[PDB]
Design a protein around this ligand. Sequence first.
Ligand SMILES: [Mg+2]
Lengths: 222, 211, 204, 233, 195, 240, 244, 235, 231
Amino acid sequence: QFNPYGDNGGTILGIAGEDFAVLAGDTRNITDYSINSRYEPKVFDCGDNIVMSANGFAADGDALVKRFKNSVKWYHFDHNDKKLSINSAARNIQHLLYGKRFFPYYVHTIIAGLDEDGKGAVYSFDPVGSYEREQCRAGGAAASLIMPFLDNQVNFKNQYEPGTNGKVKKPLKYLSVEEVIKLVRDSFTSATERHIQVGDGLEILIVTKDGVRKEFYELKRD
Amino acid sequence: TTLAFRFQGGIIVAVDSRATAGNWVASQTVKKVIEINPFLLGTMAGGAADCQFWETWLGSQCRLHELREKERISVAAASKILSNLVYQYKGAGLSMGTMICGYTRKEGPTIYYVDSDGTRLKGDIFCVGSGQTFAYGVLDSNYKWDLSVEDALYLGKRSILAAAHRDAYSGGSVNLYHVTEDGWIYHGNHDVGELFWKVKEEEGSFNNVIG
Amino acid sequence: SDPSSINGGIVVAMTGKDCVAIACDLRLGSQSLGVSNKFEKIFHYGHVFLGITGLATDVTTLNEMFRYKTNLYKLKEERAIEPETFTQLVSSSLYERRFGPYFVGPVVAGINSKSGKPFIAGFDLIGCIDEAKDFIVSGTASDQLFGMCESLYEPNLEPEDLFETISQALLNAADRDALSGWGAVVYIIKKDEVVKRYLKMRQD
Amino acid sequence: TQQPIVTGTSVISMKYDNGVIIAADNLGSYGSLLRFNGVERLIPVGDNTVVGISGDISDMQHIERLLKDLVTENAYDNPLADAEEALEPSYIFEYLATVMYQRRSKMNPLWNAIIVAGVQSNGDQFLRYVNLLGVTYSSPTLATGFGAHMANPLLRKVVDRESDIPKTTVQVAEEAIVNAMRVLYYRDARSSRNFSLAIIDKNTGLTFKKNLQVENMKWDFAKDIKGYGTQKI
Amino acid sequence: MDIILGIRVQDSVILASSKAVTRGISVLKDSDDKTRQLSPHTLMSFAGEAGDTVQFAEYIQANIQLYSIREDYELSPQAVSSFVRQELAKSIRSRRPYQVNVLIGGYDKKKNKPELYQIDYLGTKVELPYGAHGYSGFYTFSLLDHHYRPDMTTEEGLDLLKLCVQELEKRMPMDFKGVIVKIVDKDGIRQVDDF
Amino acid sequence: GYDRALSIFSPDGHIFQVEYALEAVKRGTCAVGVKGKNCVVLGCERRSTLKLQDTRITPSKVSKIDSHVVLSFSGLNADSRILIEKARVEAQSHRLTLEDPVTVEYLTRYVAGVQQRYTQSGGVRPFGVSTLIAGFDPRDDEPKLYQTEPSGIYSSWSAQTIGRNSKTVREFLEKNYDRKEPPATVEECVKLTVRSLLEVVQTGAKNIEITVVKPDSDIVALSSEEINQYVTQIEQEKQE
Amino acid sequence: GSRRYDSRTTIFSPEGRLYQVEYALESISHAGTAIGIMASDGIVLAAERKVTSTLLEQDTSTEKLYKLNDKIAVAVAGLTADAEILINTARIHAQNYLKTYNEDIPVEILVRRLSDIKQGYTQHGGLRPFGVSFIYAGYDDRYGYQLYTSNPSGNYTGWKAISVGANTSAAQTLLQMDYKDDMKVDDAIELALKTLSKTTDSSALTYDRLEFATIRKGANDGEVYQKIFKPQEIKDILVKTGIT
Amino acid sequence: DRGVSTFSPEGRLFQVEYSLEAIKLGSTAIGIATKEGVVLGVEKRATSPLLESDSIEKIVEIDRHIGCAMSGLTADARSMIEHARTAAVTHNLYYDEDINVESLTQSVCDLALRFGELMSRPFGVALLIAGHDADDGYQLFHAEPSGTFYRYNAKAIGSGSEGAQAELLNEWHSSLTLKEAELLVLKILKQVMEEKLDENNAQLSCITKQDGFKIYDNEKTAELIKELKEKEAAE
Amino acid sequence: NNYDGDTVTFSPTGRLFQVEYALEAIKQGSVTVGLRSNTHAVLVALKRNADELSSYQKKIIKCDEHMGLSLAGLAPDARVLSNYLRQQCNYSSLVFNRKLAVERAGHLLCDKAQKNTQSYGGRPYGVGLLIIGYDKSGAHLLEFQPSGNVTELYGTAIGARSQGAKTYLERTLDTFIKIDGNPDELIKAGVEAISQSLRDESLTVDNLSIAIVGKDTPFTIYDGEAVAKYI
Ligand SMILES: [Mg+2]
């Protein structure tokens, strides 16, 4: 019988700073034990300072990003070129996903940008459109490898203040863009070593009030 | 694990914040209470998307009622909008366990349990989710109608903590709400990590864990 | 989960000299559980008698349906429907539900008011007509009724005799079926009089 | 939902400095590896695009008609149909990509893997893949079925990354493709000796080669192989 | 939704319905009323699939209440039961059938006679002196067959019901948390406060 | 289907089919609504040109929509049945979804909405009917009286009349009804309603129908003898 | 387009009347007279056939009096073809009610539905209304013996005695004059015939120009019989009352 | 007769032009936009003294940030209001924000021309749609049955419109306070109204960023009527 | 006279009067100008107000990044046709990853307008459009009329007293056609063109509406203080 779903592998990572946000993804596209491409981007500038990735089944991912980019276009036409706030974009994507509740888009979605106070925002979705704002989120194949590391190194979980008998927690603070990109690069090199579907290349999209900048870094090709 | 119970001081609503995909812990920071309107609360159990989407939709339907009838909707009417909606979808695979909690002058404090099978139940006490049995154990044992507001809030908080401990698919933090004639009041987010040890030390309970 | 043997029950019809007889058990059950001992399976539209075995919801529904159709027939035709014509109407109505059938085994009995000829017929659930000189059998003890009828029956029995033969055919068939019995009714049908007798039988 | 009956095997392709190469054998295969030969699986669309198709032959012939139908439609009320408003590889691919994905979403797929090889108006090399699931990807080397497993590894030794494309000549690229086709003939039970090769060059245009045969095969060593271990004779 | 009983005595019909609502391993409620008043002299108890029961009961209630207003007349118990049967008989060949079993107890003011109707989810209607749905009848039918009389008073009928409930509380695996009892006579519908 | 726009605008900005529908209402038998302190009364005229009538079975002029709301009307009798049926269905539909009987204002707003829809739908003419809708909201003791008309406009009235010679009986009510002090009792309210109809009817025999609605679904229709006593009392007091 | 040829059958006049309904009533006024009289112990239906021919088969003919079920009959006045469409609808509605409730349809419910169908043709669809007026004679266990009339407007009303069709003005004055409440069926039969005998446009009222029916409780113990009179039975009742 | 969507020789739609005549017959409605809020006032115009005036709803809430005043065949407005409320709530459900006043107006105006041989005739009612949003601040729109809408600093519609509009032309400036605008609506209503203006036959409302859309009580409007008379007598 | 009742009726001289009446709605509309060079295409529109308290009716609608129009006549009809163009531009992008040709845009508007002139019950569109765009064959200006007749032009004008601006462009043709890689100068020529269609009233800051599209210029609309430069 025909199976309408597939797994194109890959893994994505969103981190929110004080006055910035990053959305990272590996550039490897796979089916089973074959490499389809070593450079196939799945992190996209959608306009209005919103970056988006739909990781999982690439066909469903491309379809959703295409539909959302179109949703941004028609929001401008229908509401006098008004800027689509990240919170509004998130709710719109919930409806796009829940629209196919009984034939889901098999993807994990993460959008990054700035909220209306200019502070870094990351939203993560399930396949059928349940969503939540988060400081930190990894998605896709190697999510299970990256996410606990980010709990430790971003949210300082299970870290206490030396000499306080584990009574005083290590204080939460915003990380610089330089410190965040280090954690992203290490997160992906670590995932590349232990996950066969992750490697080839890492593409990071950084969102500030100035706009959307790109950085590329080579990963192991085995 | 979600619960809501009626008492002298109104309604207590307490929920956990954990989401799981199989044995993978997807989130520890989920908001399982939908605010809806200042006198109406919804709890979420089962499918995250099903609950979040349809209870947000319920908030829209409740707003339209109030624009059209120039009156706030009753908890009975609000609960039946949601129960009638899920009944249309019955057999399609919607997964929802839910409690509609609110005060209105004509009804008083009211709790309605609504699930995706189409069950709609009015009751004083309800616990819904994988950890409901753990919550019920603590709630039923210490529940009195004439509980104080401070004691009722603690019992709700304590009953979630009990379930968070024993249930693998419950945990993260406890979100506390108190519903009166004036409306609902948020009583904060309590991380189970810090709460557990505080409760153990102060209550002298949880003797089963290393001490 | 076999609709024709959830509720259970039997119908038998026989021809005699210038008479017909139709008889049924009174049991309605939910598999092993006996529910009602007053569930008659024989209905009449004027002088045409219809017995129906099988799923009890469909027995009630088809009775209500044929009452409806024969009531409209009489108003338009300005005369009671005859057995031969009613037989065709049962066949038409069942085959209309060919791929979603009524789980029933109907039996038609009556005397043609013009010719005076005794008439009986049986049907399957999709409306195939079994027209027979001798007898027709239906229900969960059909095998049992076929055995009793094929040995007990002889042609041109008088009404008083035909009563004994059909009665003994039903009673002995029902006693060898778990889902049949709990009482029995026999209709003896002459040209211009109809006697209805309730039989005393074992209540197990 | 369907099952493929008669199918085409691997389509292989790669980019070089001034264009793209694409090749496919001329065989249709039945159920238990039964063969049939005399099937062209390379569809030239205009003089700047070649569409290589693998999978169900019946679905391939349907797609062949859609492309012929597309060229006719583009000409309608178009004075620049043979110039600025001529069909591009990017346009033809996106059409096919759209069809493949909406067919899978209706649970009635076209049981094919497609590679669109061409040169754009600005001279940019175009090479992209789409299949029955509507999954799409681009790479300096693209292959379907067995080709993905056996051809890609060979073609990636010539062009491993984007920076290798300018250093790769048409002579080198064609040799690599022709060699890869022989390896597929050795090792694929659904391959044939006869194949077609197409070159789309920005300077020299589209060159279409038919009735090509695998040559310079190594079989001589077979005479020295006796039994399955211990047999000496 | 498990236990629904019905006894028709001389001058009234008594319906007894279990109070428990069980979802999974937990008993959610112990005070559930598995009945709707269809008209002032007609009561319907129900049991079956969750949601379907209440949805079906309320739908019937609305249709009978609509007839009552339109004609300014109370439909007879026989007429209400026939309407309810036809609705279930439609349901069974639907895309998604109502999985609901009902007892209809009514006092016919024209005949001055109590009437009890048992209808299953297939639309299998039967008129009985006493009835039950599901596993309830497994114990109660033998007991009623022994003790029941047609000329019993309401008090006699309630004592005979206590004997049925005691037998169920002894031999049934589930705790159904007791029964709500309702009497339907010439004066209408009242609930027995203590049982 | 038949699509023709029958209700359209004229150069002067009128919709003649809606205005001609009001003429049908003006031809209809007189209907009056008077609301007191703790009750509402609906009085209705029955033309006396019809003798050998069976009053038992003849459709009554006042219709119960629910146990707590009543609808009277002036205009085409056949048209009124369609509005009453739709209203009765909506009343049971409201109870089923909101778990509460309709307010009088809601039931009015629904009926008015139906009447409006028939003024800008293709292939249909407007209803030749104006309605008086009276009753008490659930768990409320404040009397409610609303009027609807073919256009679809509705509004609340202390007292109001519709149908033939309604302008005469409205004249009467405008000077005889005190806003500051409405009819305190049931008797007072029924008397003022009968008095107002006696300005128009002809005879107070089998020509006047009275229906008294009170809080908590307490609706009763008065008989001939009961109404005849009010007629006898008013005529004796008049001769002064 | 087609707008040019649309008569607009469902619009109001400036006076607020329905043209097509008014003109349909004008049509019905030229139809043969039908009289219904309701007694304490039964109902009489009498109707005049439209100018009979000598070679018309009288015995096997049905123009005026139609059976709806065992307890309800109608007298027709207007287009016979139009009446038969509505009669077959009414017959089905009755059997639908019996199928649903296992009770014979109450008279008013059948009348209201048939009246509601007529109403529809005046408010939507853009078709001509039914050129038919009915006298409904029926019995149910709620209101007992009942007379109703419906007309193309879809309005219906109850009556102790009523006429439809030709010379109703004259017929209604004669009924109003001689009718009383404690009247028997036999007395009502005599009134119906005497009224037709005086309102008829024919020279003399004969058996061959009449249709007659009674709904009595004449059968044994609390059951209703419908008697559609034969030609010979009309001839006998016409001599017995002393009109011939 | 003639088609419903027919053009006149002048190039106007007959049925649209005729509906504008219906709106002239309607009771007066006035709207004034300021930097402190937008005020909406209406003439109630009870046909008889027995009619309970408080039951005349010609000022209507669409969302918390958008109000509406109507003039013409007011029954026709019910489905327009229903659509506006549905559009406002639906947009909030899809985008988790308040919907722009212009976007809501544009939605209502998209019904207007959905008639022909869809509904049988145009709407016989004009709307004043007043609201606030973060982008374009306090706004007043005039929605016609033509499908056209204009933004206005101030606008009058209904029987006394041409007289009222001439008065608003002189009186309106960009520095008007909310209190000044309230008195100005009441002043111009009392000028064009047949019967004498009081708290029973006239109604005030406003929309402010802080408190949203509020219909003024009869007690509140009465004080503003008393304040208006004193200030006009003062000079 | 007898032949103007609907769009399905020819006159004895072979005229469609309902179409000719729709054409009349455009003449009553406010003036708008369109002109282009080889590099850029410009729309200039005179916006019309109800009174001094009212806003100025927006005349220019964006259809894609590379295409938009100005309207004269029934604004709601412009909304219907511009929404249709937006969808056709959108369909071309999503399905073919291809910017819709300005010529095809014309053909699609023509064929949509035509169907409404041959069917009973429906009416012709009561608006004229000037479509500008930059596609693969450079700058383009189109004139749409609700008869269905679409025309490609170097320049034109529609609305009341449009003949003044159309005459100027006819004279200026050889000058403005060669304004390549200079947006401001091409707008200035468009503003001087629309000025030939003014009577009593002059161009003010909230009165004038300009739009431009070109080689390295997305379709952008200038209103308010942004058009103060060109007065
Ligand atoms: Mg047995």
